[PDB]
Amino acid sequence: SSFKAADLQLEMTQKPHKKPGPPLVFGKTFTDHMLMVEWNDKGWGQPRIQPFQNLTLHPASSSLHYSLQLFEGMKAFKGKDQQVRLFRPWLNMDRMLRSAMRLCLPSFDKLELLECIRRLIEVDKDWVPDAAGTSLYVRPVLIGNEPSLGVSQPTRALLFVILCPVGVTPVSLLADPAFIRAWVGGVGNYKLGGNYGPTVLVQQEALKRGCEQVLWLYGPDHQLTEVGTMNIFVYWTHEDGVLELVTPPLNGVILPGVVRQSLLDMAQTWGEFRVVERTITMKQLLRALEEGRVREVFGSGTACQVCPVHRILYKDRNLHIPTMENGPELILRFQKELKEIQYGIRAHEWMFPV
Amino acid sequence: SSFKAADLQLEMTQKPHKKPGPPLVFGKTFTDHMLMVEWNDKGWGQPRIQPFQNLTLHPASSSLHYSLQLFEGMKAFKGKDQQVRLFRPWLNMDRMLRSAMRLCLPSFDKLELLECIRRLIEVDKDWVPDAAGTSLYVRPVLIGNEPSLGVSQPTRALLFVILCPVGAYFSVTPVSLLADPAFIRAWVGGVGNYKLGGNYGPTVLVQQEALKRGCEQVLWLYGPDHQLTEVGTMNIFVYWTHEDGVLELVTPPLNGVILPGVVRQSLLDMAQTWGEFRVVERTITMKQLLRALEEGRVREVFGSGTACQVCPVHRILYKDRNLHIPTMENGPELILRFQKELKEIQYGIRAHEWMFPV
Numbered sequence: 001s002s003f004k005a006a007d008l009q010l011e012m013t014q015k016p017h018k019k020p021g022p023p024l025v026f027g028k029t030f031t032d033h034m035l036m037v038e039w040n041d042k043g044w045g046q047p048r049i050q051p052f053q054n055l056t057l058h059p060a061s062s063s064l065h066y067s068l069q070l071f072e073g074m075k076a077f078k079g080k081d082q083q084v085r086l087f088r089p090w091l092n093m094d095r096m097l098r099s100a101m102r103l104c105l106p107s108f109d110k111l112e113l114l115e116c117i118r119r120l121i122e123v124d125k126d127w128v129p130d131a132a133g134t135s136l137y138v139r140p141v142l143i144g145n146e147p148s149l150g151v152s153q154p155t156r157a158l159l160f161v162i163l164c165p166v167g168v169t170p171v172s173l174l175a176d177p178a179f180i181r182a183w184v185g186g187v188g189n190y191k192l193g194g195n196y197g198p199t200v201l202v203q204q205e206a207l208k209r210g211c212e213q214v215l216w217l218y219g220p221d222h223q224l225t226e227v228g229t230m231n232i233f234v235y236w237t238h239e240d241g242v243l244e245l246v247t248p249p250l251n252g253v254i255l256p257g258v259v260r261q262s263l264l265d266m267a268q269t270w271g272e273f274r275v276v277e278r279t280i281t282m283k284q285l286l287r288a289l290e291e292g293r294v295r296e297v298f299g300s301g302t303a304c305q306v307c308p309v310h311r312i313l314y315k316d317r318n319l320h321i322p323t324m325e326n327g328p329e330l331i332l333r334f335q336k337e338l339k340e341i342q343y344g345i346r347a348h349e350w351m352f353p354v
Numbered sequence: 355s356s357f358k359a360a361d362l363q364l365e366m367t368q369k370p371h372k373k374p375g376p377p378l379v380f381g382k383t384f385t386d387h388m389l390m391v392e393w394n395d396k397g398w399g400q401p402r403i404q405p406f407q408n409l410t411l412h413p414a415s416s417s418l419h420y421s422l423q424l425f426e427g428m429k430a431f432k433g434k435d436q437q438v439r440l441f442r443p444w445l446n447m448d449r450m451l452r453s454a455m456r457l458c459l460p461s462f463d464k465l466e467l468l469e470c471i472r473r474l475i476e477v478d479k480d481w482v483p484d485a486a487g488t489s490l491y492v493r494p495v496l497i498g499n500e501p502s503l504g505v506s507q508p509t510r511a512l513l514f515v516i517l518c519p520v521g522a523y524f525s526v527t528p529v530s531l532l533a534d535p536a537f538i539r540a541w542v543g544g545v546g547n548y549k550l551g552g553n554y555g556p557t558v559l560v561q562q563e564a565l566k567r568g569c570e571q572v573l574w575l576y577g578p579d580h581q582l583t584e585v586g587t588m589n590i591f592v593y594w595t596h597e598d599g600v601l602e603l604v605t606p607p608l609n610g611v612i613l614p615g616v617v618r619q620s621l622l623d624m625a626q627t628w629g630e631f632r633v634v635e636r637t638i639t640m641k642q643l644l645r646a647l648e649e650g651r652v653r654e655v656f657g658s659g660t661a662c663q664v665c666p667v668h669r670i671l672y673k674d675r676n677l678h679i680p681t682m683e684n685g686p687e688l689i690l691r692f693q694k695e696l697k698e699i700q701y702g703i704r705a706h707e708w709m710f711p712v
């Protein structure tokens with residue numbers, strides 16, 4: 001069974017928050033409403049769009065003791081004509097259902113959640129900014145909610161969604177093999193709360209070491225997996241002399257990002273250079289930097305879309321990454337095309353109109 | 355700058371709950387009171403004892419989004435003298451603090467929290483069952499509580515403690531295990547050695563697989579050489595005559611994928627005090643166990659943990675093939691001896707510095 005949009009009950013807020021005035025730090029400002037659906041031994045209850053409010057949770061909730069939690073993250077963009085659109089939300093929904101199944105949280109209908117989310121965005125339509133490079137960030141969440149200290153499949157869960165309005169520059173990265181984000185056979189390929197908490201300290205260590213984000217290396221040959229909460233891409237002339245865009249394969253330690261998949265799809269479609277999913281090693285990068293074969297290194301994710309990398313501190317070796325002196329041509333093309341699609345400049349099967 | 359037990363605020367339930375009748379499934383029944391301490395940028399607030407009540411969380415709470423959550427688990431036992439005691443609670447406090455640092459959560463005084471726990475258990479004295487095999491389980495938690503989607507060191511946090519009466523866990527019955535290398539609990543350089551909630555959520559599906567394959571628990575293998583690391587939520591001990599023909603008790607070393615259990619340390623301490631056989635921390639592979647089994651050198655295999663104290667193992671399903679473990683054939687003398695000494699100590703029959711009186 002599943003909750004249905006047609007059963008939605010609306011409680012409009014009686015106490016609207018002041019909208020942001022002319023400074024937007026990410027993830028602190030929320031809209032007036034939220035979506036709220038509960039699961040229990042009777043199945044999924046009816047979905048509510050209701051005033052943004054606190055959650056009331058039993059102290060034994062499995063969400064708090066055994067990290068029976070997962071999230072999603074996606075943006076809604078408002079175009080010139082004030083039409084609002086979600087970017088490839090179906091893939092976020094596919095990925096939310098996989099997380100849930102990995103955590104034995106209750107299954108749900110992807111299209112019904114989407115419609116509920118759309119309905120929720122429509123209620124908070126005026127929170128969606130329209131200045132350049134601004135968007136509305138959508139945070140669905142599903143948590144187990146059994147009041148039991150037993151490590152087990154819960155018979156109760158909570159699915160809710162909240163929204164935040166959100167308001168080119170290259171970043172530096174610490175690449176230390178000591179630090180591990182995910183392992184083959186682990187759950188790094190799902191968007192689960194537990195994958196993030198442990199990175200806080202590591203991120204602090206990268207700041208202390210004068211870097212801005214973490215380059216997560218994995219395995220004996222130090223594979224480049226991800227950058228911060230982003231997938232990583234390298235544009236270079238490979239060893240076989242062919243020009244390629246490369247990014248690591250989905251072999252268990254990589255989060256299957258929506259932006260990532262989009263960049264692959266675009267480049268693939270262009271048909272101008274080779275586009276592969278393959279392991280990338282610090283050894284390959286060093287050698288390609290020594291031989292001037294690297295053009296652009298960047299990260300991708302809903303946060304920035306495309307984020308260039310100028311520097312990588314590999315232990316004590318400070319590597320200059322020449323992304324910016326090579327345009328950054330590919331990056332700029334990706335941003336340009338993504339902007340066109342996202343803000344309705346160009347009609348595309350990737351946008352879902354609210 | 356920690357909270358303080360002198361500042362503790364007491365607020366007694368208006369109407370209490372009727373204690374269970376001597377039917378108790380673990381973790382579904384709680385006592386009348388709980389402890390709560392709030393932290394923010396003005397540091398720790400005053401701790402409080404309050405009637406068991408629900409948490410009020412901002413929906414962006416970092417505890418719920420990025421798994422800023424850690425817990426502990428320790429038992430209190432009521433002796434004949436109706437006096438209740440905590441088993442080595444300082445090791446749990448040490449571990450709770452290390453977990454807190456790992457998750458960038460706020461530091462606190464181990465003795466102050468321990469004193470507040472004393473008071474909480476004191477207040478709920480009567481919930482502590484004295485029937486044989488029973489105890490009060492104590493569950494401290496520390497969760498982040500920043501109301502922002504930024505992945506970061508929170509500026510707010512919540513520390514609470516709830517209590518469960520527990521029935522006799524078992525007589526002692528062995529368990530069968532699923533040993534499948536595809537499922538990996540923790541990795542070197544990871545956080546499997548901290549009691550973080552994020553280590554437990556992904557084990558549900560695996561545990562469910564073990565049941566469909568006819569096992570009761572998971573034997574967590576690690577490496578290409580299939581090391582026996584842990585059993586369910588228990589550390590693993592093997593009693594055998596080793597390759598060199600020397601009788602020993604072995605348990606994997608704390609190389610980072612092992613949770614340093616309090617019973618584990620205690621079994622080690624106890625066994626070395628007896629000084630009657632070799633006690634060592636060494637890696638254990640399925641290759642070594644197989645051969646030991648074919649040669650009749652394995653006497654007992656068991657788990658250790660607060661839940662069980664000591665849990666016999668009698669079967670391992672490895673590579674579709676069932677491995678019989680003669681634990682029960684061999685007494686289990688070691689297990690039985692361990693169980694007895696802990697019991698005597700835990701219920702104050704023998705006086706011991708491991709016990710902290712409530």
Ligand SMILES: *Cc1c(COP(=O)(O)O)cnc(C)c1O
Pocket residue numbers: 073191226228229230231255256257258259260300301302303
């Ligand atoms: C969210 C996330 C990504 C990329 O996600 P998108 O769907 O592209 O926004 C990549 N890696 C990690 C670790 C993430 O949490």
Ligand SMILES: *Cc1c(COP(=O)(O)O)cnc(C)c1O
Pocket residue numbers: 427549584586587588589613614615616617618658659660661
């Ligand atoms: C809690 C726990 C143990 C044992 O801990 P005790 O301190 O002995 O109760 C062992 N392994 C795992 C994975 C645990 O969570």
Ligand SMILES: O=C(Nc1cncnc1)c1ccccc1
Pocket residue numbers: 026073137166229301302303304503504505
């Ligand atoms: O996208 C994220 N953060 C973000 C969004 N918009 C601007 N800056 C940062 C994110 C990703 C993964 C986990 C948590 C947050």
Ligand SMILES: O=C(Nc1cncnc1)c1ccccc1
Pocket residue numbers: 149151380427491520523554587660661662
């Ligand atoms: O001690 C635990 N569970 C338990 C306790 N008493 C009886 N049965 C089971 C435990 C340990 C670690 C993580 C979660 C729970």
Ligand SMILES: [Cl-]
Pocket residue numbers: 149150151
């Ligand atoms: Cl349990």
Ligand SMILES: [Cl-]
Pocket residue numbers: 189250251252256
């Ligand atoms: Cl995947």
Ligand SMILES: [Cl-]
Pocket residue numbers: 503504505
């Ligand atoms: Cl962030």
Ligand SMILES: [Cl-]
Pocket residue numbers: 547608610612614
């Ligand atoms: Cl350790």
